[PDB]
Amino acid sequence: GMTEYKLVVVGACGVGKSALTIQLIQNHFVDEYDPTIEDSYRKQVVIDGETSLLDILDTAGQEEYSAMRDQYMRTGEGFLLVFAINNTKSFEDIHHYREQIKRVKDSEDVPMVLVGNKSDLPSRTVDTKQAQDLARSYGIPFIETSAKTRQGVDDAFYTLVREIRKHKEK
Ligand SMILES: *CCC(=O)N1CC2(CCN(c3nc(N4CCCC4)nc(-c4c(C)ccc5[nH]ncc45)c3C#N)C2)C1
Ligand SMILES: Nc1nc2c(ncn2[C@@H]2O[C@H](COP(=O)(O)OP(=O)(O)O)[C@@H](O)[C@H]2O)c(=O)[nH]1
Ligand SMILES: [Mg+2]
């Protein structure tokens, strides 16, 4: 059979949400993508032997509270919390993204993966320990990715699917 998964990618402007999503859906690096374009993108893959349809919402546009965005999170089954390793502000924001998702879901048990993107860049500002410790406090996996080289990209998305599978068994 097959399983469908609703994924939502969140994080600050410019962390690589679209680039990561496009690497998953199209298998190459797209370095310029309109920051106002928010959409869902479907991609059929195979994960641990089962056909899996990933509907991936790539959040974008205006950072503004809206009921429409609350509905995205309510519908969403798992969330990539993305920051850039060379952007301390985007890492600081992760807390707020998690808090907002937790608010909507009304739960502390929500499938999430912390993603540190732009791992290819030489000048990092957010240390791995800081991210590892934050993920530990949340009880979620941490995966370093590069949308540029594709390092860790499948691992990030597939790990999130595996976290959703576990949650669904409860
Ligand atoms: C450069 C453009 C870009 O890629 N952006 C990502 C957004 C659009 C969606 N964003 C967003 N931001 C926030 N913030 C709260 C703390 C700092 C920014 N919250 C939400 C959000 C969440 C995570 C959950 C529920 C929400 N309801 N309204 C907003 C909600 C989103 C979203 N989506 C930044 C700019
Ligand atoms: N070096 C590097 N650049 C990246 C990576 N991911 C995204 N970028 C670049 O970062 C900028 C923002 O990427 P984008 O996908 O638009 O981020 P979004 O605003 O979160 O969707 C663009 O100039 C991308 O080319 C990465 O893994 N490595
Ligand atoms: Mg984008």
Residue numbers in the entry: 0 to 169
Excerpt from the publication:
KRAS is a G-protein that functions as a molecular switch regulating cellular proliferation in growth factor signaling pathways. Mutations in KRAS impair the cycling of KRAS between its GTP-bound active state and GDP-bound inactive state, leading to dysregulated cellular growth and oncogenesis. The switch-II pocket is a shallow pocket between the effector protein-engaging switch-II loop of KRAS (residues A59–Y64), the α2-helix (S65–T74), and the α3-helix (N86–K104). Upon ligand binding, this pocket undergoes significant conformational rearrangement [e.g., increasing in size from 150 to 280 Å3 in the case of sotorasib (3)].
We describe the construction of a cross-docking database comprising 100 examples generated from 10 structurally diverse KRASG12C inhibitors with known X-ray crystal structures (3 of which are newly solved for this data set) and describe a method of incorporating receptor flexibility into CovDock to produce a docking protocol we refer to as FlexCovDock. To further benchmark the performance of FlexCovDock, we collected ten co-crystal structures of structurally diverse ligands demonstrating conformationally diverse switch-II pocket poses. We then docked each ligand into every receptor structure, leading to a set of 100 docking simulations (10 self-docking and 90 cross-docking). As shown, superposition of the ten receptor structures from the cross-docking data set reveals dramatically differing backbone and side chain conformations for the switch-II loop residues (Ala59–Tyr64). The adjacent α2-helix (Ser65–Thr74) likewise demonstrates significant conformational shifts across this set of X-ray structures. This conformational flexibility results in markedly different ligand–receptor interactions in differing X-ray structures.
